[PDB]
Amino acid sequence: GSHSMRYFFTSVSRPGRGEPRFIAVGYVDDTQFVRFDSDAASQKMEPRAPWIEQEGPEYWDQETRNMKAHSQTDRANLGTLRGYYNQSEDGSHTIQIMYGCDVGPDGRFLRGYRQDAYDGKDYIALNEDLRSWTAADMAAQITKRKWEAVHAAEQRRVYLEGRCVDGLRRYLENGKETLQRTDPPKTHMTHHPISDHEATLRCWALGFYPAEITLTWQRDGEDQTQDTELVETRPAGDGTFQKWAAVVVPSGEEQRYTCHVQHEGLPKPLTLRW
C-alpha cells in the first residue's frame, strides 16, 4: 500500500515572558517518530519511534540544526506577519506549517506538500504541480511575490521529490515490522434499552492500525446516516486507534440493522448484527 511522511510545526508568540514556543512533530503514516520542543531541556530533535533510534549521531545533529533554523525563522516571521495584518504587540499569534510527501506501494513519488497558516487560517500553500503558490489573502500575496522572485517553489520541489522521498523509503524499510503492519479492529456490539419501545445499538472497533476506518449502520441494507452518532477516530495511546457508531432502533427490530466495518487490516469487510 501507499505511505506518507508529514512534518507539523507550531510557533506561538508569548508577549509576556520568553521567546515564542516552537513544537515540531514528524509522522510516518499514523506513527509519530520525531519531536522538537523549545521548552524542553534537551534542545535537540528527539526519537519517538524505536526504528528511528538506529539513525546515526550525524542525522540527529543535522535534524537539531534544521529545527533551530525553523524556530528562528518562525520567530522572525511572527514579527513580519504582525506588521502585514497591522496587529498590536500585546497579542499572542500562531504560525503553523505542514510539509511532506506520499509514496506508492512500489516506493515511487506520488505527491508533495507545503502549506502555511497564520492564526489557524490558510496563508500560503504550494500547489500540487510544485511550481506555483496559492495566496489566501492580500498579505500572503506580498510573500507570494517575494517567493516567486527567489524561485522558492523549485527549491521546495527539490526537497519533496528528493530527500523527503529518500527519507520516507529508508524509514519504511528500517521499520517494516511496525510501519508496513495492519492491525485489524477488534469488534463488539452493545445493546441498551432507553425505554420499553427503543434501544441503542453501539458498534465498536478497537485496537486497529492505520487510523483509516469506515463504520456504517444499515437497515435492510440501506445506509443509515440519518440518526447515527459517529464519533471521531481516537488514539488508544498504545499506537492503535478506536471508533464507535451508535443508532437508536425500535425494540424487536434489532435484527434488521447491520454494522459494516471496513479496514485495510480485514481480509473481507465485517457485517455485525445483534
Binding site: 514528524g26 540544526r65 534544521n66 533554523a69 522572525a76 500560503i124 517575494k146 527567489v150 522558492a152 529518500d166
Partner: peptide, 9 residues
C-alpha cells in the same frame, strides 16, 4: 528528514 532552511515571509 526535514528541510535545511525556512524562507522569510
Amino acid at each position: 528528514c526535514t528541510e535545511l532552511k525556512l524562507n522569510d515571509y
